[model samples]
Target: MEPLKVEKFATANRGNGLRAVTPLRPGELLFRSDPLAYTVCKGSRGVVCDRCLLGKEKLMRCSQCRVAKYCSAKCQKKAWPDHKRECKCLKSCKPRYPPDSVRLLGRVVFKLMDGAPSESEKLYSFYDLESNINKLTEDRKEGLRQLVMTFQHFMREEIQDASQLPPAFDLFEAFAKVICNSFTICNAEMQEVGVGLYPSISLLNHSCDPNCSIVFNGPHLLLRAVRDIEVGEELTICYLDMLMTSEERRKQLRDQYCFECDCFRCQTQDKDADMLTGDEQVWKEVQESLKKIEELKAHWKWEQVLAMCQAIISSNSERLPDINIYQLKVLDCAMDACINLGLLEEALFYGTRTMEPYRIFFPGSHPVRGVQVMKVGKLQLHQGMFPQAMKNLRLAFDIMRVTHGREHSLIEDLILLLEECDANIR
Candidate 1:
């Protein structure tokens, strides 16, 4: 059953849009969507099992297709119907899997040929996803032209003759629309795994301070309320990094998404009031440290980064805000280091400190706050703080349910932990 009550609205810059029909509570499900069309990314090929997009290292490649991979024979068999069609198509190319952009386009085209999904009236025919046709950079338009030619040559001669298919220019419009509107499918830790199309959800426009955030429950997209909403409030999600400064985010929006962000966050004149507190000398030191952190992240030695994070705090503890968006990045890395090292006590220290501002600053269902709180619960469990763990895990469970939902693999694991906590609580 659907969680959201959808209705139409006229927006300022975004033309027509969707808004919530009923009041939505914080930490509650907004909606879930099965992708109209989608594809797994190239890097995830052998690592993420083909059928379910499960991240498992133990995987086997399809002997014939070489494009498809599976964690087990069952998964292999389950994927065969879809994979077999793409298998023959992919055999024409020297490399089995096409580039990720092309792979995503091909999947959408394949779904169109097979007949758009019947579950929604919006999908019964060619999707009307916006293409931003006149707005795309000329270079990108030309790239699509080349991709269209490549697709025609690689797929089949009859693709041109198919009635569902549009001509070259029109086909580019559809491909652009798919590219513009699709969502990235990420794992629990937010690593990109696949791409997806969620029409109703995509219709909701962008906001820097979004009321909702999305998570995946297998192939379906779950949109969850990250804050309480009025009966007729517009549902929104961030298309860019939520942590970016107003200027940076707006610039990216204009260049990439072809729109100016006028969100509440962007409306602010001073976005760095927190970072502005520290000395210029200390700020430079932090900037230099961040570069080192990035280099370390390439082949991460967690202990070294931990030392660096600790050093920064020790040197300029007074300078940093308790949990500004900028500090949140450093704090998370610190938490990561302690977490991966199995240093539960230290992890809890950083995690707990991070939560102070998280509670005061962000919405209850904010993904960052949920992540910090989740790690805190997990660290507390490891530290034998059963009562503390229970309190935090309960909070985390409610927050995650808003995004991940009851059926997510992550939710199931957390459920097991909660059950154990209950069985052994002191």
Candidate 2:
């Protein structure tokens, strides 16, 4: 698949990148790569397997460390080689573990010490990745310095001396690379489950409107095409949130990733649809309320969330376009809150408002788009809009077939709903 479908090529402008070797079809599997190292996010511990990154009702916690968890004994044993030294370090930090960064960098350091093999088929090694150390802003550089100190303390037990470490190793450089190159591992529903660093996947560059998206099956990442591609076109994916205005996106890119994004969407500015249009006074009020609404969600205050979202919508929905990032976020929150509060009709109305904007923002075969469509379809099904439900479910099915693959557990749920819709329509 590597030789036939994709190849790494050098670029005159940006760093090297991956390009399609042949015309690629939408949802086509490009290549799969295992993470060099990964760790469950600190917040996600006990909820998702540390090794496989899958969530379950209960997990087997490592008796020694008690911080790491696996779905089963098999997974526990499988991760031992990767978790061996870190397990002891975790025990040392007993009552609480270090930040996810320290834990992840610890495993990466351990692997480098053990001389783990790089990906079998690759033009570049993990060592070849750019650190942007010289490019990092002064504040970011200082932050990295602190993380490096924290990492040293976290791995103090395992690494007694820097002199004995692997050749060509620089803790500061590695920290920078991991911080910049790592990918967030998300579950099927687009929730962050873990963090992974795929050296190969990092070779691809950023685009506000990307043609590809990364999907995870356990620890393995599959790069799937979100749309068609022509031969010789460089494969791209978004590193920033897609909802930001062009100026916001480019500012973030320059500050964080140290590159200017001139992607088509950024260049055109999407006719400023990404920018909010309300008055300054209203904007401040909206911002404060939205912040409070997020806190309410953390406390499971659905009624307050729904009320706040509705208030914002009633006042601003007519003023802002549906595609406005803030408006979409409030609508999404309201939809979730209404659904949680069992206000089905209201949830359906809010969910419907988001459909077109989601399509435009997420584009072809994105899991968020597919899942939102599935959510609206289920809501419609509950409201006895059988034909509408069936239409959306099928649209969702097509998208998820690519993003989640046909055999995923969510597809089973979708199939059941589709079957129910078919039966009811008859």
Candidate 3:
């Protein structure tokens, strides 16, 4: 499918800095996404089995809504958690999955409420909306709070109404919980759908010297100007992860997004901190080490995996500045080794360390952070600490949904993992 066309934003300066304007404040509509703009599929890179995509032959429909068809019982089973929540809603809409206006509003709410506490202040400031609920006049504030609570209840009902498939309630609940915790509110409009959530306010355009940064609240996207923006300046968002070297960013964008970013950072003659120095040998070694680690993991060689992880760490420690990718790999290998060896304590310790840098590289709600949390949760599960395990797993799943969206493959895995852990604990 072709990528959605980018829309130019209206700009304004808000004294402290410049901001892209949207038509609402907290509790008001932002922008909604067109349901048809992006297709949801069951696998990686937008691949969907013919049967599921076409809804042909004797393919199974999810028992609750039957909107999503699966190629086999296994795929159906795998998709249960996420599908369950949407099934009833889709079924109620019948023969149609509903328009972007209806669906995206709920989705936006779900996103904003997803990881709210962490994003509350930023969200309020980004839209220039009121922040302290307590400061509002008692009567007016009560009404607004009720509105927020009503929206929350509405989402819960919609999810429950959709999850009626036999034996899938627990899975649906897990899915709902995760989605509920992934986003923050924004102030843009969905021109096509007319259901304003928070449009692309957080997508602050790309520049080598970007003036803004983005944060995610549960599922709501927020753009904050990291540096002051002058009036009338165009807002840009960096689609590629910021931690990536310029070469990596260019290659990734070209390969994935089909665009060559001539963003100032990409064209700048000065070597930026994150820019690559054309050391093919260094990258080659990094890739080879990663490949070896993957091989060790496949073989389940815990001891060798640990040794390899240590070797990678030692080799990278003396570099003028640490390589983020190598640091990530080292943590991953170490965590995997600890888990495979049933060393729960070690796994938790290394997992926490890994997350420190990850938070800096990605938003708090990014899916990679979910994986790190899942590692810690898995360790807790093995140690018979059910409460801690549940907390970590739930948080991980929520972060993943926010980062990757509800349809992403990792959401299903996380839901199943959480469900299985919950069952074991009970």
State which candidate has the highest TM-score: 2
Model 2 reaches what TM-score against the true structure?
0.87
lDDT string for model 3 (315-426, tens) is: 7656513335555656767886876577778777777666555555554354445666777776777777788788888887666554444434455767886898879877
Per-residue alpha-carbon lDDT of model 1 for 1-426, expressed as tens digits?
Answer: 744366667787686576878787776675656776666776666667676788684778777767677878987886664676677677667575566666666666656545435332242233556678786888788877988777666667335444656445256676677667768786665546787777767677887778888876556677777777888787888876555567667677776568877766677743446534455566656766777875563333677888888888776677766545555667777887887687878888888887765675555566656666777887888788899899998998877777666656787877888998887773
lDDT of 2 by residue, 75-185 (tens): 888888888888888887877678887788888765664554767226556788888877578878898899888888888887877885787988888888887788888
Candidate 1: stretches off by over 4 Å: 1-4, 27-30, 88-97, 120-126, 142-169, 269-271, 275-361, 405-409, 422-425
- Model 1 lowest lDDT segment of ten: 116-125
Lowest summed lDDT window (length 10), candidate 3: 185-194
The Cα RMSD in angstroms, rounded to one decimal, for candidate 2 relative to the true structure is 3.2
What's model 1's TM-score? 0.79
TM-score of 3: 0.37
The list of candidate 2 runs beyond 4 A from truth reads 1-3, 94-96, 113-121, 288-322, 334-350, 405-409
Query: In lDDT terms, which candidate is top?
Result: 2
Residue 343 deviation, candidate 1, in Å? 6.8
User: Which regions of candidate 3 fall more than 4 Å away from where they truly are?
Assistant: 1-29, 32-236, 254-283, 291-323, 333-343, 363-426
The candidate with the higher TM-score, 2 or 3, is 2
Candidate 1 vs 2: which has more lDDT: 2
